[PDB]
Design a protein around this ligand. Structure first.
Ligand SMILES: O=C(CN1C(=O)[C@@H](NC(=O)c2cc3cc(Cl)sc3[nH]2)Cc2ccccc21)NCCO
Ligand SMILES: O=C(CN1C(=O)[C@@H](NC(=O)c2cc3cc(Cl)sc3[nH]2)Cc2ccccc21)NCCO
Ligand SMILES: *Cc1c(COP(=O)(O)O)cnc(C)c1O
Ligand SMILES: *Cc1c(COP(=O)(O)O)cnc(C)c1O
Lengths: 794, 796
């Protein structure tokens, strides 16, 4: 039907159909009168994966021959989501498969709903790695993503009685047709033991866990390129001994549900080394099949989680390859680069020295050696600056001596980058200021991006098409060509069509909620905040605005208000008490608002259950207003924001992370910017933040806190939200009250624009047209030329 | 090359090569450039697997609405699946040609496949032969069991000692299983019994999911493909909660390596209820797709007492869930269930402590006591005033620990009870189940064990199969009684030559196997083979006494000629069993002296065959000259290894125990090396000292064992063997020693007469027909299940 999804030729369609029935017969062992809806998905899944094989083999054989420099994106997280539709898109098979399945009497989009999400990530950091994998393939880069095959991904969230309930994400339950086990490359990973020193060093008496690789294809956009994601699963090398094999194998069991937080879990450390040791061993093998090592190898560290790659490569070159220290260290630093994702201090990985001593004795030794030579450098550039040394040291002082993994990374990386312009500048000026003064050349910016395949062509084919009608399809892998749409801001047809595709998407998401769960008003402003639940994200600020909306209606029931459906989605860390309370608050607001006869259709507040990649694909194309309301200086970049912008939502936001650059690309008159700037946060910090001042001064704010505290939103348990109130009044690091007045005033302005369909749509066009910079193709190109030292090719 | 393996039709060969390359490419993602032998096995496995699916779908659709037979077993000792599949679909020759043209040795590919070693020994191997026979006899038969992640331990010999390694048989994936997610079921554990307005309900339980995997069971050239359904366990701070999922999933992780023993392990009971609860749920769903007709549509065969919980579980579903009255439900249950016993050894009997059942299965314990009361009321009615009889028949045993006897349970709830060999089925009626036979004589039957002539002849001994078919055709494969036509060829010069030719060929193949995988044996020696699980009752120790006697006799008379022997002993010991582990090390310790004495050289060799399993049996058994089957009379219920040796052309030295009796009967006692005490004779003792003093040769050997002749660095190592043989031998080894050695002299005397050795072998092979599992299954079908076997073909 839709030209962007390619051709459905007669002979090509008949092939798909024969191979569909073939797979149902031989692969799934079924007839047409016994086959389950899952069986049909799998037959199509296999039908599509057959088309990947040839190119995959050829792609990797092409790299062997050209022998380009190899990019290894090292990450504990790959938030991949579904694979079927994405594969069909990248290979231009979508229409021909849709027709094939229709002819056979099946709804392909219903079949697509059976695939489990590869939810191997927590949030932004993890989905960035997934977007990167897409872009690196589309740009022809010799790139491999290296990670862990968690048996269980991010927990599946159930909302029970208004509360978050965690259940296991058993994604591999029915099989993974999109992975290929490669047991020929099973490798030993070592733990514990001790270190002998001889006339070199020798790591002896270790416990072994095998690492078994599973390869998953990464198709580039219509370029016949198929790269690889390699994920390692833990494998053990009378009766109790056999069951005790579980302990070693628990290393790859489950993804740690920690978004932006650190705890020194020993199992976490084992995971990070597991991935590091196996990957690096695999990298060296491929290299041999070391002066030229950094000419042929780039290792990108996605946060400090794989920071162990620094001493581990030092361990291999020195202890096993018998290289001199200084030479191994030149090679190591030229190889590794580090991407920082957050300035929040509780997220910073600082491992107890004791824990590293027992588990990785040799690595501890090397860390201490790296630290001495590095501080000898700091002492030489800044002689007598004693306090600089203790600040820049990898070893932290205390009743628990710790290793600062970030400091390890900066010392062992030739490139250190932030994720948005403002965040990268924050690193030079504050958190890494000492490091910036020592080696300013190391410090870069690489503003995040999102893939316009999954986040436009895949999730919003209707928008992709109306754009295609005007400028062709070249934009899909050259997103800057969206600026051509500026010439259409006064086009009556395009204005009609943009509005039309939005309503259509809003209708589809409304059907999804009805079918799977709730009735939402299709004729209301879709107000959406989806992301992880954190204080810094300030879902709680959204909450105060929603209650403001509610109280304003109660104060003047007859007064028209632009009807809104307020949607908030996101998972809370299972151990995050405040985040769990925040989810409970949102549902409890909904309990009162959604049932008050006076309100009715004017205001609905719903918590979107189990926010994940496949849900993002559904809800973001249906959003009108994108909530991006972090307190300035807290959100390093954001990527959810870029998705909303590309899918036709207007943004209400602070001047934080990539919101700054989004406002710059679209012009600040097409953006609903509000609140404190970073400077204003410092002004409050230096003077001391008193939220009681705001309380005593703002009557509407006063009303809500008394509602919260007295029990208006928890009648059966009036005590319920006391921790939220006490925090907001006396321990708010995130100054929710300081931005309340500007937020509510700025939301009034949003409602004013919505009352005017035409000027809402024209502002929408101005956003879509200038989202081009926020393609991950742009991001990867900068990484490649500025850090990796390779040239992309489409 | 050979006729018995079918046609290598040019068109099949072309399509076989095409699908091989296709699978290598699409399924395996490989080129001939980076493909290993393992890739090549899997490419073939998939190619052959494809030929099963059409038949498999059409078979299960065909199931006419016949009565369905459900063989329930904790063990299915299947072995490998590639060759067996090709034989039954008549594709062996076509695939040998296909891989040849592709530059590959098909037999080298077959060696990659791991055994499905989901069994300990005979019991589990029996289930496997039974599935094959039931498919070949066209019965709507399902095998139900557990998918152990780790089968029977892989055995390595280190320092002459048994090492145990985990049988990670699933490591590279199993092409021969098909997961069936739509049929995942909840199995419940622990919880409590509460009482509602309408009956009892089992609530507040812990749930473990049961995930079914189906394996195709092809019939020999009849287009029938049945199913073995094997259940895998699946779970329904946060991190620890996810990790703790391992606990439920541990239920299906490992096969208990107990063979002749009962361990009251709680994890074992969980395994038993796991398979039973899921199976019965499955059975009832297919029945629904009135319970008076349940027995005419369902037969549940209980392989030993391991699945005995099926009795209270069927009662539970019928009463608590389906709401039938107790009496009617009980009628359905007894008419549906039948019990097979496999041993009389007291330590093997399952006797679960009442305390354990109460906690894990509180509702089943209630139902057990209710069954017991109604059963004992019955006993009291038939034999009024026999109080002792009541305590002896009760499902509940008194003592410091109250226990439920599962065998008493099975008989009470079964309409048929059978032993596995004529002699054993009789001793059941006369001793261990004497009282139950007196109450219900109609229930007690015999079903002599069998082995499949496909796997145990056409597959493992194709050369033998071929020379046989050259005389009588291929009809014998699924009609083994036709082997009696070979009796006519007993004076035939060509057949005598051919039988000898194929045996020497098999001996050369095994001698190459040993040199390749583990290195030397002399191919021109008598192959004296004892392979089976290691245990006192089996008497590997009697073999050791003969071996040492043979060694001492050559050292006393060095110039005297002796018929050269290669004595091979193979088998696994139970990892707890200290005495069985000592036996294995004693066998290697002997070997260590005898194999390095320059005066002996190639004249006598003693070797321990490492890692005996189904795939190894298929190698050594075709090569054996002498089958050792030397169990103390009364202890081996039937045996099955004995039958394999007979069909493959080995002579048998054995006691009149188990199926040895019927083997000798079929062939004629002239054609068998019978020795030692019969059952009657054993019942006249249970003093080994009497033998030691009267027999000077026996004396010398026991002086060598204790004084440290076979263990120099460890002088007292075998003190426990000496002490047990002298004082605590339950299996009177010393009592049969004398007859054993003399009978072994008559083995050697015949061997030095090659024509007469071979003629007797002919008489053995030709009368092995009865010991086909097709004969066993026909009987089960007719005499227990009430179904008619058919060798009728299905279309296409
Ligand atoms: O080497 C194998 C052989 N093998 C496959 O490669 C396996 N193939 C794939 O999983 C696979 C194939 C393709 C093509 C892709 Cl494109 S992604 C992908 N994955 C099929 C299979 C089935 C049963 C047993 C083994 C296999 N397996 C190791 C598994 O632990
Ligand atoms: O390559 C595959 C394809 N595959 C099957 O083999 C496929 N079917 C079988 O395992 C299978 C097929 C047949 C035919 C038989 Cl006859 S026995 C048997 N088993 C089911 C499946 C489901 C989900 C993902 C992949 C598969 N799997 C390797 C495991 O990742
Ligand atoms: C993009 C994405 C995130 C990150 O969104 P932010 O608003 O930038 O925090 C988190 N979760 C999912 C499922 C995503 O797709
Ligand atoms: C048949 C067989 C057995 C049973 O042999 P017996 O001598 O009757 O105990 C045990 N293990 C394997 C592998 C077999 O094939």
């Amino acid at each position: 039907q839709i030209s962007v999804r390619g051709l459905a030729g007669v002979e090509n369609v008949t092939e798909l159909k024969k191979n569909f029935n073939r797979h149902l017969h031989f692969t799934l062992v079924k007839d047409r009168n016994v086959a389950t809806p899952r069986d049909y998905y799998f037959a199509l899944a296999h039908t599509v994966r057959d088309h990947l094989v040839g190119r995959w083999i050829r792609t990797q054989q092409h790299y062997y021959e050209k022998d380009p420099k190899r990019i290894y994106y090292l990450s504990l997280e790959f938030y991949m989501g579904r694979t079927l539709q994405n594969t069909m898109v990248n290979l231009a098979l979508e229409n021909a498969c849709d027709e094939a399945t229709y002819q056979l009497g099946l709804d392909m989009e219903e079949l697509e709903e059976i695939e489990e999400d590869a939810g191997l990530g927590n949030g932004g950091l993890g989905r960035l790695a997934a977007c990167f994998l897409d872009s690196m393939a589309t740009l022809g880069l010799a790139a491999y993503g290296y990670g862990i095959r968690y048996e269980f991904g991010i927990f599946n969230q159930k909302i029970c009685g208004g509360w978050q309930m965690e259940e296991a994400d058993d994604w591999l339950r029915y099989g993974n047709p999109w992975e290929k086990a490669r047991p020929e490359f099973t490798l030993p990973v070592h733990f514990y033991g001790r270190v002998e020193h001889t006339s070199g060093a020798k790591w002896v008496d270790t416990q072994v866990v095998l690492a078994m690789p599973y390869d998953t294809p990464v198709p580039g956009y219509r370029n016949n390129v198929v790269n690889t994601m390699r994920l390692w699963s833990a494998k053990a090398p009378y009766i109790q001994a056999v069951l005790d094999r579980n302990l070693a194998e628990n290393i790859s069991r489950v993804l740690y549900p920690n978004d932006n937080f650190f705890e020194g879990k020993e199992l976490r450390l084992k995971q990070e080394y597991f991935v590091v040791a196996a990957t690096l061993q695999d990298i060296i093998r491929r290299f041999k099949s070391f002066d030229a090592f950094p000419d042929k190898v780039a290792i990108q560290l996605n946060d400090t989680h794989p920071s162990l790659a620094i001493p581990e490569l030092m361990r291999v070159l020195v202890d096993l390859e018998r290289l001199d220290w200084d030479k191994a260290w030149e090679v190591t630093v030229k190889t590794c680069a580090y991407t920082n994702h957050t300035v929040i201090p509780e997220a910073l990985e600082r491992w107890p020295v004791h824990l590293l001593e027992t588990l990785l004795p040799r690595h501890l030794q090397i860390i201490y050696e790296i630290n001495q030579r590095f501080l000898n450098r700091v002492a030489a550039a800044f002689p007598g600056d004693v306090d600089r040394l203790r600040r820049m040291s990898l070893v932290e002082e205390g009743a628990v001596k710790r290793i600062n993994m970030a400091h390890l990374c900066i010392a062992g990386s030739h490139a250190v980058n932030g994720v948005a312009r403002i965040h990268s500048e924050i690193l030079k000026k504050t958190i890494f200021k000492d490091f910036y003064e020592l080696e300013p050349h190391k410090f870069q910016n690489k503003t995040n991006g999102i893939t316009p395949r999954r986040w436009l062509v895949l999730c919003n084919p209707g928008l992709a098409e109306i754009i295609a009608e005007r400028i062709g399809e070249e934009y899909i892998s050259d997103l800057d060509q969206l600026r051509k749409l500026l010439s259409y801001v006064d086009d009556e047809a395009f204005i009609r069509d943009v509005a039309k595709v939005k309503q259509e998407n809003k209708l589809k998401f409304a059907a999804y909620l009805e079918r799977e769960y709730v009735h939402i008003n299709p004729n209301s402003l879709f107000d959406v905040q989806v992301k992880r639940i954190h204080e810094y994200k300030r879902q709680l600020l959204n909450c105060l605005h929603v209650i403001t909306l509610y109280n304003r209606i109660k104060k003047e029931p007859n007064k028209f208000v632009v009807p809104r459906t307020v949607m908030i989605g996101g998972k809370a860390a299972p151990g995050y008490h405040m985040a769990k309370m925040i989810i409970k608050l949102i549902t409890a607001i909904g309990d009162v608002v959604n049932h008050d006869p006076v309100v009715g259709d004017r205001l609905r507040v719903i918590f979107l259950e189990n926010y994940r990649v496949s849900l993002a694909e559904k809800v973001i194309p249906a959003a009108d207003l994108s909530e991006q309301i972090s307190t300035a200086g807290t959100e390093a970049s954001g990527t959810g924001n870029m998705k909303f912008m590309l899918n036709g939502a207007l943004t209400i936001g602070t001047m934080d992370g990539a919101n700054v650059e989004m406002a710059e690309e679209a012009g600040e008159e097409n953006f609903f910017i509000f609140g404190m700037r970073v400077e204003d946060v410092d002004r409050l910090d230096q003077r001391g933040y008193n939220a009681q001042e705001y309380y005593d001064r703002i009557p509407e704010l006063r009303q809500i806190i008394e509602q919260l505290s007295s029990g208006f939103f928890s009648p059966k348990q009036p005590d319920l939200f006391k921790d939220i109130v006490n925090m907001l009044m006396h321990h708010d690091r995130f100054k929710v009250f300081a931005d309340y007045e500007e937020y509510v005033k700025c939301q009034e302005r949003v409602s004013a624009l919505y009352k005017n369909p035409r000027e809402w749509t024209r502002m929408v066009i101005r956003n879509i047209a200038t989202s081009g910079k926020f393609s991950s193709d742009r991001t990867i190109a900068q990484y490649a030329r500025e850090i990796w030292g390779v040239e992309p090719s489409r």
